[PDB]
C-alpha cells in the first residue's frame, strides 16, 4: 500500500547545504528500501545498523532522513567515527549510528557553468558539534585574541565559506548529494515497516 515519501527526499529539486541539513521524519508508512538498494544511481550505500538486504524485513518507530550536499571527498566523513571538517563542524554521526548513508554524484544539476556558490559549509567552529546537531549560526568567528566587535576583520572569519562546484571539477570537488537514514526504535509502537 502507501509508500513512504522517499521521492520528496531522494528525488527533490534543491537539497540543503551541509551546515543547514534538512530532516524529514518518515513515519506511518511502508518503506520499500529495495527501490533504493537496487538503484544504479548511487555511489555509496553504507549501512551501519543492519545489512542493507534486510531493510525490507525490519520495522521502526521513525526513520529520520537527513539530506545535504557535500564534496565527493567529504562523503566518507559522513560514516560514524570519522574525523574532518564535515564530520566535526557540519554533520556528525554517533558511534552506534543504527542507519544508512546513501550518496550520489550530483554534478549534473548542483553545478552551474561558471561555478555554483549556493552551497555553504562551516570551515570554523569553537568546538566539534555533538551527534545530529545542526548550527545555522552565522556569528562572526573569534579566530584571534582581539574580540570581533566589527562585522568583519583580521581573524574574524565567516564561520561558513562556500564550495567550489564546476562541471569540469574532478571526482572529489564534485557535489555529492547525501541522505542519511537514521532508523530508530523507541517505546512508541512501530510504524515504518517493510512491505509484505
Amino acid at each position: 500500500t502507501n509508500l513512504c515519501p522517499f521521492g520528496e527526499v531522494f528525488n527533490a529539486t534543491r537539497f540543503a547545504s551541509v551546515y543547514a541539513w534538512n530532516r524529514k521524519r518518515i513515519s506511518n508508512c511502508v518503506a520499500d528500501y529495495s527501490v533504493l538498494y537496487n538503484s544504479a544511481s548511487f555511489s555509496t550505500f553504507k549501512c551501519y545498523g543492519v545489512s542493507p538486504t534486510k531493510l525490507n524485513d525490519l520495522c521502526f518507530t521513525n526513520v529520520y532522513a537527513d539530506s545535504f550536499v557535500i564534496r565527493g571527498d567529504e562523503v566518507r566523513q559522513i560514516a560514524p567515527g570519522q574525523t574532518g571538517k564535515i564530520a566535526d563542524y557540519n554533520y556528525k554521526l554517533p558511534d552506534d549510528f543504527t542507519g544508512c548513508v546513501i550518496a550520489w554524484n550530483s554534478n549534473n544539476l548542483d553545478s552551474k557553468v561558471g561555478g555554483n556558490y549556493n552551497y555553504l559549509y562551516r570551515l570554523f567552529r569553537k568546538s566539534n558539534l555533538k551527534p545530529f546537531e545542526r548550527d545555522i549560526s552565522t556569528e562572526i568567528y573569534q579566530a584571534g585574541s582581539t574580540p570581533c566587535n566589527g562585522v568583519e576583520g583580521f581573524n574574524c572569519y565567516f564561520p561558513l565559506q562556500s564550495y567550489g562546484f564546476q562541471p569540469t571539477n574532478g571526482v572529489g570537488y564534485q557535489p555529492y548529494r547525501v541522505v542519511v537514514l537514521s532508523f530508530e526504535l523507541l517505546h512508541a509502537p512501530a510504524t515504518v515497516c517493510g512491505p509484505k
Epitope: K126, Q142, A143, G144, S145, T146, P147, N149, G153, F154, N155, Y157
Partner: antibody, heavy 119, light 106 residues
Framework: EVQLQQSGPELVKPGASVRISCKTS????????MFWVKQSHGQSLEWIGG????????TYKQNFKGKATLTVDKSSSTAFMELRSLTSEDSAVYYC????????????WGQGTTLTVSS | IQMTQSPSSLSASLGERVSLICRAS??????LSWLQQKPDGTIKRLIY???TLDSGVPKRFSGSRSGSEYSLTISSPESEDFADYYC?????????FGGGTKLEIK
C-alpha cells in the same frame, strides 16, 4: 617543546632591504596566528603586524604597513619578515610571536633579532 | 589608541610591595596582557584577560581591572623580576603597548 627559533644579529648599510626568519616548533603551524614586534634600544616595543599562516591572511599597524612585509612558508613551517628601504628609522631588536583565542595569546616569543642599519 | 602606564621606573627592596598600572582613556572591554622584558632581551607573558595567567608564570602574581585602570601587583620582588614591564592592548588592531615601566633595586 615550544621554540620560536629566529635569525641572528644582522647589519647592512642604509638604503637597502633585509631577510628575517622565525622558525616555529612544538605545535601544528596552521593552528595559531603569527604576529611581530619591533623594540628599539632607546624606545619601547611596537606591534609591526601579523600573518595568520593558515588562511594566508595579513594585518599591520598603519605606520609599518608601508615598510613591513610578512610571509610564511608552510613546508618550512617558518615565518618570514621582509623590511625595505633600510633607513635611520629601521633598527631595533625585532621579535616574532604566535596567538589564538583559547587563552594562548602573545605568550611565547622569539629570541630577538637585533637588525642594525649602520656603517 | 594606547593606554598609559603610570610610572616609567620604580625602585624597591626585596620584600617590598610593587604595584604597576596601565590606565585607560577608552574602555578596552577588559582585553589586556602583561609582559616582562629583561634588559638582556628575554620576553615572556605574565598575565592575560582579566587577572588570568597560563603556561609557567613566576609564583602567583596577578592584577585586576581596577575600574578605569588595568593593573599588575606582586607578592614579592625577585632578582629576575627587577626588569622592564609592559601592558599590551590586544583589544583591537593595530595592537598597542604602554611605554613600559622598569623595576629596580634601591
Amino acid at each position: 617543546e615550544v621554540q620560536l627559533q629566529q635569525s641572528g644579529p644582522e647589519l647592512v648599510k642604509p638604503g637597502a632591504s633585509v631577510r628575517i626568519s622565525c622558525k616555529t616548533s612544538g605545535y601544528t603551524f596552521t593552528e595559531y596566528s603569527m604576529f611581530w614586534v619591533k623594540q628599539s634600544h632607546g624606545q619601547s616595543l611596537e606591534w609591526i603586524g601579523g600573518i595568520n599562516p593558515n588562511d594566508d591572511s595579513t594585518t599591520y599597524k598603519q605606520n609599518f604597513k608601508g615598510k613591513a612585509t610578512l610571509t610564511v612558508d608552510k613546508s618550512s613551517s617558518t615565518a618570514f619578515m621582509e623590511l625595505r628601504s633600510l633607513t635611520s628609522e629601521d633598527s631595533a631588536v625585532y621579535y616574532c610571536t604566535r596567538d589564538r583565542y583559547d587563552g594562548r595569546v602573545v605568550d611565547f616569543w622569539g629570541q630577538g633579532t637585533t637588525l642594525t642599519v649602520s656603517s | 589608541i594606547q593606554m598609559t602606564q603610570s610610572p616609567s621606573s620604580l625602585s624597591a627592596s626585596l620584600g617590598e610591595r610593587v604595584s604597576l598600572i596601565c590606565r585607560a582613556s577608552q574602555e578596552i572591554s577588559g582585553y589586556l596582557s602583561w609582559l616582562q622584558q629583561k634588559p638582556d632581551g628575554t620576553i615572556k607573558r605574565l598575565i592575560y584577560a582579566a587577572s588570568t595567567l597560563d603556561s609557567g608564570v613566576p609564583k602567583r602574581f596577578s592584577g585586576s581591572r581596577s575600574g578605569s585602570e588595568y593593573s599588575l601587583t606582586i607578592s614579592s620582588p625577585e632578582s629576575e623580576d627587577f626588569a622592564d614591564y609592559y601592558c599590551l592592548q590586544y583589544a583591537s588592531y593595530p595592537w598597542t603597548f604602554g611605554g613600559g615601566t622598569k623595576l629596580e633595586i634601591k
